[PDB]
Design a protein around this ligand. Structure first.
Ligand SMILES: [Mg+2]
Ligand SMILES: [Mg+2]
Ligand SMILES: [Mg+2]
Ligand SMILES: [Mg+2]
Ligand SMILES: [Mg+2]
Ligand SMILES: [Mg+2]
Ligand SMILES: [Mg+2]
Ligand SMILES: [Mg+2]
Ligand SMILES: [Mg+2]
Ligand SMILES: [Mg+2]
Ligand SMILES: [Mg+2]
Ligand SMILES: [Mg+2]
Ligand SMILES: [Mg+2]
Ligand SMILES: [Mg+2]
Ligand SMILES: [Mg+2]
Ligand SMILES: [Mg+2]
Ligand SMILES: [Mg+2]
Ligand SMILES: [Mg+2]
Ligand SMILES: [Mg+2]
Ligand SMILES: [Mg+2]
Ligand SMILES: [Mg+2]
Ligand SMILES: [Mg+2]
Ligand SMILES: [Mg+2]
Ligand SMILES: [Mg+2]
Ligand SMILES: [Mg+2]
Ligand SMILES: [Mg+2]
Ligand SMILES: [Mg+2]
Ligand SMILES: [Mg+2]
Ligand SMILES: [Mg+2]
Ligand SMILES: [Mg+2]
Ligand SMILES: [Mg+2]
Lengths: 123, 49, 175, 72, 71
RNA sequence: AGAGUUAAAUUAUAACUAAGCUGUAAAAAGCCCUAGUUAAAAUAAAAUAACCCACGAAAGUGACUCUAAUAAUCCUGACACACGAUAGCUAGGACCCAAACUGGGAUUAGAUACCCCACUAUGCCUAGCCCUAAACCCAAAUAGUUACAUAACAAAACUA
């Protein structure tokens, strides 16, 4: 997967929720995006209260949208997400699974540094 | 091998129709990533419910 | 301007078996469409080195490096268009335009015909470095401009004063 | 220590800036005064050429612009 | 390390402050410390995790770090 | 280099509540359109992580995200070319807070200062200049060696 969409949404009832998600992925599929998956992380009370669209929210629903999109596009979708009345905060991150795991071989122990000061028979 | 992986996931993708399915499913099955650690390197995932 | 078409199938997937039968979704995923820009630059690199070169394999070939460098320059130029305030990348571009000139001086000294054909292909022109780099300042540019025009005049005057002698001596010889 | 060299500089600089404040307009004269010599010598430099190249007038379309006195 | 598991990132944060413990406490490689830090900051701006205190839910979870506050 | 975003704090401005609040070695002036609490945009600046030592040619760079992206099959090289902290200059915006200047207040023989209080150019953005630093790691670049060898001190001595 290429890109990841963290959707924090205004907590609603089910129908309204469904609507919001649907039109979101519609917008994406219109900017040229291929949607992999949809992961509902639940409705949580937000860590802190978020003010957007002249409403200050306590709780919210959490969603994760993996998708492939062309480079040029990401701005467009960000704009159309910011415009949206029920998105309580958008974001788009390079999907975690493009990033490689380069093996910690372990701790390479660092030896004390020597030959800093000159040898001097002082005092 | 890569090309065939993607060939396999092409069956599982979300397309214009499956929206109606997928969305209805996403709400049905909440999934967690929440995940922990033990001093031995071991993981303890969320306690069984 | 050239245009590595949206559907072009990123380089590393080009020659693998059984591609065209594959459904349009995955083709769309491995297209230049979904690509980073780096990919498009791999393509441009390939195409240029095919059109221009002799032996696609040699990296170390003076020619090869000139072509590659030229690709990256052309890229820095677009990145220059969109960011005019970016001093860093201006630096890269201008170092690189130069290094290309360096290796071109190498071709022009060593293998002539090849150098020639590269200059033809890549639209690069070789202007010999002019002796005496001196900042031309207002006083000098002005005094030279004047002098140039004084010359341009004195040859005119000399021309006429000898032309009336041509006319006079010919009109005396004729009758 | 080496501060004792810097002290001198520090003083000499300060004592100079102070000077250039009092003297400012006297200075301003003598600067422009020499710019009007410059532009003139410059002119003569070129005049010399017509007269040396045999032309009577300065060549066609020559206003001989003022570089040194350039302002704003 | 993902910015998604806030439990994990909570494990490396001071409960009362919301501080991020240093290597000399957490005891991590260079790359894993850095990884954790960035992950946390991401989790804070995206708001999966709060800034100024350890989410109470996770106070009762296993404790990794070497700090002794209460003596 | 772009484009988008904000967690802590602060401020407008309301709701209450108390008369004080601020400020130093000690005070005074200052403000009570003040202060504590509860709400809350903009602007500005980026705790911890950092006991890390990465990235850039250097200046410099450490909130978040995405886009673009880090010259050279790699020797040296200018008065040429392109950059160059702060401060400053030009035009237009911004203005929480800081603050040269200046005006009060103390201190003082004096106090054009150190302390206090306000407030300004200015730090901020966009575009254009200016081209200076203890621009210093005071240690030129590129290959080497640890042989020979202690002026002193500092970061040990040297080839090409
Ligand atoms: Mg010693
Ligand atoms: Mg002197
Ligand atoms: Mg003079
Ligand atoms: Mg900008
Ligand atoms: Mg705030
Ligand atoms: Mg407040
Ligand atoms: Mg307030
Ligand atoms: Mg006190
Ligand atoms: Mg009083
Ligand atoms: Mg610190
Ligand atoms: Mg450092
Ligand atoms: Mg790139
Ligand atoms: Mg390089
Ligand atoms: Mg060089
Ligand atoms: Mg400067
Ligand atoms: Mg400035
Ligand atoms: Mg101001
Ligand atoms: Mg304001
Ligand atoms: Mg103030
Ligand atoms: Mg006074
Ligand atoms: Mg006294
Ligand atoms: Mg004192
Ligand atoms: Mg003010
Ligand atoms: Mg600045
Ligand atoms: Mg410095
Ligand atoms: Mg120093
Ligand atoms: Mg020096
Ligand atoms: Mg040098
Ligand atoms: Mg070099
Ligand atoms: Mg040796
Ligand atoms: Mg001795």
């Amino acid at each position: 997967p290429r890109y990841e969409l963290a959707l924090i949404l205004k907590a609603m009832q089910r129908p309204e929720t469904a609507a919001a998600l649907k039109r979101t992925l519609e917008a994406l599929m219109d900017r040229g995006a291929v949607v992999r998956n949809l992961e509902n992380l639940g409705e949580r009370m937000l860590p802190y209260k978020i003010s957007a669209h002249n409403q200050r929210h306590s709780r919210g629903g959490y969603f994760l949208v993996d998708f492939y999109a062309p480079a040029t596009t990401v701005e467009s979708m960000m704009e159309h997400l910011s415009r949206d009345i029920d998105v309580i905060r958008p974001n788009i991150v390079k999907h975690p699974l493009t990033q490689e795991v380069k093996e910690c071989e372990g701790i390479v122990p660092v030896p004390l540094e020597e030959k800093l000061y000159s040898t001097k028979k002082r005092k | 091998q890569e090309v065939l992986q993607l060939q396999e996931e092409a069956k599982t993708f979300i397309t214009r129709e499956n929206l109606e399915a997928r969305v209805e499913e996403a709400l049905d099955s909440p999934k967690s990533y929440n995940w922990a650690i033990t001093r031995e390197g071991l993981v303890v995932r969320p306690q069984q419910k | 301007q050239d245009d590595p078409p949206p559907s072009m199938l990123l380089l590393d997937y080009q020659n693998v078996p059984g591609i065209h039968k594959v459904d349009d979704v995955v083709k769309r995923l491995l297209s230049l469409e979904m690509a980073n820009q780096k990919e498009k630059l791999k393509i441009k690199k390939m195409q240029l080195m095919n059109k221009v070169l002799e032996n696609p394999e040699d990296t170390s070939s003076l020619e090869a490096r000139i072509v590659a460098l030229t690709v990256k320059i052309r890229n820095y130029e677009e990145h220059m268009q969109k960011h005019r305030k970016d001093k860093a990348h201006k630096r890269f571009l201008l170092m690189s335009i130069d290094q290309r000139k360096k290796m071109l001086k190498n071709l022009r000294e060593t293998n002539y015909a090849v150098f020639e054909k590269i200059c033809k292909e890549l639209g690069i022109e070789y202007t010999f470095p002019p002796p005496y780099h001196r900042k031309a300042h207002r006083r000098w540019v002005t005094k030279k401009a004047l002098c140039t025009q004084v010359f341009r005049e004195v040859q005119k005057l000399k021309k006429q004063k000898r032309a009336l002698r041509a006319a006079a001596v010919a009109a005396h010889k004729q009758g | 220590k080496n501060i004792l060299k810097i002290r001198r500089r520090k003083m000499n600089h300060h004592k100079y800036r102070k000077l250039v404040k009092r003297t400012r307009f006297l200075r301003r004269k003598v600067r422009e005064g020499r710019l009007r010599q410059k532009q003139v010598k410059f002119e003569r430099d070129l005049k010399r050429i017509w007269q040396k190249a045999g032309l009577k007038e300065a060549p066609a379309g020559w206003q001989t612009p003022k570089i040194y006195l350039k302002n704003q | 390390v993902d910015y998604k598991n806030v439990q994990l990132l909570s494990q490396f944060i001071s409960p009362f402050t919301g501080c991020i413990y240093g290597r000399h406490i957490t005891g991590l490689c260079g790359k894993k410390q850095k990884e954790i830090t960035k992950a946390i900051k991401r989790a804070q701006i995206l708001g999966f995790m709060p800034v100024t205190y350890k989410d109470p839910a996770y106070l009762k979870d296993p404790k990794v770090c070497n700090i002794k506050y209460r003596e």
